[PDB]
Design a protein around this ligand. Structure first.
Ligand SMILES: O=C(O)CCC(=O)C(=O)O
Ligand SMILES: [Fe+3]
Ligand SMILES: [Zn+2]
Lengths: 450, 17
């Protein structure tokens, strides 16, 4: 029933029981300098950054290296190009990056206060500038969508200069095979910061890699822990009553150290690019006044695919939506991308085989009941679908209802939630987007490329 | 063909309170 085969794991062997000395608990972060575009575009850089033993890499002066005009992301330029669109803010307590104090200011805690409100780019910019002029609570403009191709064209054009595996869109990027928009993952988000502005502890959605460029003028301080330790960090969150996957928490560094967890700590200067490898747990605080831009990428590695599918299944256990629809993505990749890595090939092939089996069983049960199934094929830029009630991905066979609102709009449900409503599926239209033979031939057409 | 509705997918930082 799982889309993963445990036997196929490529996770690195790490023995948490081996006690580590202070030195190994404070490892250095890999810090690369690129001299030429040739080096930035080398497959060797892709291999270096995605190696499962390398959780986070900083690529020093990458902006000047490739002649990226990061001034196009200055606050002044952004304001001039913006409209009145609403953006969101987090209000936080300004505190040292290694600290997070309880209300009485007597002890360190994990839960981290970070409340939501809304503003505009231009009004947040006035706050950022007034902060810098000195004219304690702070505000952080976060997850600002730079997705409008027209409004943000010069900005987005500058990012086309990055090496392919870092780009927002690329054929070696799983997120570019979603076929619909996931704002901030396969589109750019902007972060406008004052000193103290925090992005609290997390793994990326579905454990996808992340790219972050600091525009400046200030620095950002980063903290990171290898994927391997994530369950131990989750246990701290639970101990302190904050949700690991969806809550706002800031680790106590000595808790991680006591638990034998190495923590990477480094400073990201203006023009530096941080590559966050798959599954790396990280948190970030602005040291100065700066803007960052960031998005996700899913390079075609077995480690990435495994960690994305593992989180997909864990989200299902925890009743948390996976905003990357991994079954849909897996078939799209299989149909359109040559996979030469034998580990990654075996994993995708295994996932597709389970998906075919499920769809076949589902279809045979419907046919046995005499339930009409209509074909509604895929079309360009069509989204992937999820159950309205339980938020699981619903792939291929769709159980849709128009009962509420207009009889011409339908909500999608999984089989389970559809059958809980009307056990005879009365009033449920069943669609299939891929005929049995379309999936069979896509599966057979998917073979290991040399 | 019939119009199927979807929830927009977006990354957004955690928020308290
Ligand atoms: O700039 C930030 O606040 C950090 C955003 C982040 O977590 C990422 O780039 O993956
Ligand atoms: Fe992140
Ligand atoms: Zn459901």
């Amino acid at each position: 029933e799982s889309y993963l085969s445990p036997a196929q794991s490529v996770k690195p062997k790490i023995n948490t029981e081996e006690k580590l000395p202070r030195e190994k608990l404070n490892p250095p972060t890999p810090s690369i300098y690129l001299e030429s575009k040739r080096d930035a575009f080398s497959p060797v850089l892709l291999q270096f950054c995605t190696d499962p033993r390398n959780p986070i890499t900083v690529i020093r002066g990458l902006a000047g290296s490739l002649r990226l005009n990061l001034g196009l992301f200055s606050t002044k330029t952004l304001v001039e190009a913006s409209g009145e669109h609403t953006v969101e803010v987090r209000t936080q307590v300004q505190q040292p990056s290694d600290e997070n104090w309880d209300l009485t200011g007597t002890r360190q805690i994990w839960p981290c206060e970070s409340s939501r409100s809304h503003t505009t780019i231009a009004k947040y910019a006035q706050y950022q500038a007034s902060s810098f002029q000195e004219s304690h609570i702070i505000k952080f403009g976060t997850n600002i969508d730079l997705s409008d191709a027209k409004r943000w064209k010069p900005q987005l054009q500058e990012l086309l200069k990055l090496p392919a595996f870092m780009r927002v869109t690329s054929t070696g990027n799983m997120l570019s095979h979603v076929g619909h928009t996931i704002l901030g993952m396969n589109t750019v988000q902007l972060y406008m910061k004052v000193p103290g502005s925090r992005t609290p502890g997390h793994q990326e959605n579905n454990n996808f890699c992340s790219v972050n460029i600091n525009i400046g003028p200030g620095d950002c301080e980063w903290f990171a822990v290898h994927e391997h330790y994530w369950e131990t960090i989750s246990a701290f969150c639970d101990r302190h009553g904050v949700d690991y996957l969806t809550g706002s928490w800031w680790p106590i560094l000595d808790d991680l150290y006591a638990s034998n967890i190495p923590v990477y700590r480094f400073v990201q200067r203006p023009g530096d690019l941080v590559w966050i490898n798959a599954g790396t747990v990280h948190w970030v605080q602005a040291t100065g006044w700066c803007n960052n831009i960031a998005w996700n990428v899913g390079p075609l590695t077995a480690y990435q695919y495994q960690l994305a599918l593992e989180r997909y299944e864990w989200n299902e256990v925890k009743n948390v939506k996976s905003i990357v629809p991994m079954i849909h993505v897996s078939w799209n990749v299989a149909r359109t991308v040559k996979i030469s890595d034998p580990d990654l090939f075996k994993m995708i092939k295994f996932c597709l085989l389970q998906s075919m089996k499920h769809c076949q069983v589902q279809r045979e049960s419907l046919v046995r009941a005499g339930k009409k199934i209509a074909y509604q094929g895929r079309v360009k830029d069509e989204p992937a679908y999820y159950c309205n009630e339980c938020d699981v991905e619903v792939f291929n066979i769709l159980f849709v209802t128009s009962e509420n609102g207009s009889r011409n709009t339908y909500l999608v449900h999984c089989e389970g939630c559809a059958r809980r409503r009307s056990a005879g599926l009365q009033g449920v239209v069943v669609l299939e987007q891929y005929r049995t033979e379309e999936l069979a031939q896509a599966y057979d057409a998917f073979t290991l490329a040399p | 063909r019939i119009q199927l509705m979807t929830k927009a997918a977006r990354k957004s930082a955690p928020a308290t309170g």
